């Protein structure tokens, strides 16, 4: 195992005060640190810790050249769409996972952080789009959606709509309509020296 003593910045990812919107999801390149995923797996706060292509108890042995941590906020009902091969407004227009995904999808309820009593409209999602997103593609354009024959010309009219809709997050919403913070760890393995490694001493 390579001689690295740094600790991977998982605190700044899972504890950031503000998360990104699902249409503008935030990708973080994690490298040159020792990552210890066992405390992540053994934490009871996470409602979802699905792992694809790896095992959570085995992750402390493999070494990856890069780890990507994509973080965003969705509803409770849309966490089922952050699995490979899924369909829906989130899996088609906001955040797409490839069917060849290798990594962990971590989600937890953030109703105490992202819900405001009067309504938290700071989180948005793309309601309208013409084609499905390619895997790991981000579409942050805010041009008016056509949806009709007449050109939009940048004006929201009858058939011309603003693509982004806003989540209405309130603490009194149901568990399926409450905010959930999702962190998707993608484990990249290229032909480069390994940087992100398990905490094994040798």
């Amino acid at each position: 195992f390579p001689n690295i003593t740094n600790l991977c910045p998982f605190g700044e990812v899972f504890n950031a005060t503000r998360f990104a919107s699902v249409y503008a999801w935030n990708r973080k390149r994690i490298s040159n640190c020792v990552a210890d995923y066992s405390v992540l797996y053994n934490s009871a706060s996470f409602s979802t810790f699905k792992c694809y292509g790896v095992s959570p108890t085995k992750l402390n042995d493999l070494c990856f050249t890069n780890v990507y941590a994509d973080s965003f906020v969705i509803r409770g009902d849309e966490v089922r769409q952050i699995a490979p091969g899924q369909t829906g407004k989130i899996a088609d227009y906001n955040y797409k996972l490839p069917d060849d995904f290798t990594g962990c999808v971590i989600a937890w309820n953030s109703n105490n952080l992202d819900s405001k009593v009067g309504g938290n409209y700071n989180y948005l999602y793309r309601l309208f789009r013409k084609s499905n997103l390619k895997p790991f593609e981000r579409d942050i354009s805010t041009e008016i959606y056509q949806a009709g024959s007449t050109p939009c010309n940048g004006v929201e009219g009858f058939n011309c709509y603003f693509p982004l809709q806003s989540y209405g997050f309130q603490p009194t919403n149901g568990v399926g309509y409450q905010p959930y913070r999702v962190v998707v760890l993608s484990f990249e393995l290229l032909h480069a020296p390994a940087t992100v490694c398990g905490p094994k001493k040798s």
Partner: antibody
Amino acid sequence: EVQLVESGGGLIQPGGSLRLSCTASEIIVSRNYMSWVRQAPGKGLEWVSLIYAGGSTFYADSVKGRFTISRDDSKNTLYLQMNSLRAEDTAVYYCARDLFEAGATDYWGQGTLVTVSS
Amino acid sequence: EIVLTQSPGTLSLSPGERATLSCRVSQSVSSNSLAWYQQKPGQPPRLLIYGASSRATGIPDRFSGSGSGTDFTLTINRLEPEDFAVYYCQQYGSSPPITFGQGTRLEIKR
């Protein structure tokens, strides 16, 4: 002149097949959430199927596996291939445009009656 | 699975009065995910208000929706003789993608 015109409905036998069509004017079907909603004679509205602009298709539990919603982008037509029809499938089928949080189902077709009996 | 229940099966009241229809969602949903439709007999449904408060284009100021959480209402302030039809509340966005209420019928009282 925004409009939705259904066609193809009519008499069919139980266990048969029937395909509905919905020609759109001033609405591009390939760029919209287009759904099918049926109303049993004397009963309430029931959602049947829904197709996304990207191409994702969703079906009701009662029609899953038998129905198939598609479209022809060149002809600007929305389809519903109804297979293995039962006596409970008799209803007036509406093709509708869905906007969800941006305006809900603003536009409906006139509806087409599908009668399934021997 | 979202289930919508409309409390009054039939709301009988004379023209000129105020009609208050109600929808009860099984679980607390966001207010922007509920719409109201009017179906006169032998006609396609007509959207009245979406997002639980936002009137559709061409709908007169008479129709007004409100409510949040698990309780939504539609108010027809001055019932005209053409306002007597069947009203459905619809929920959209969750699974199933579209849900409909059983419908509330308005009939003229005498």
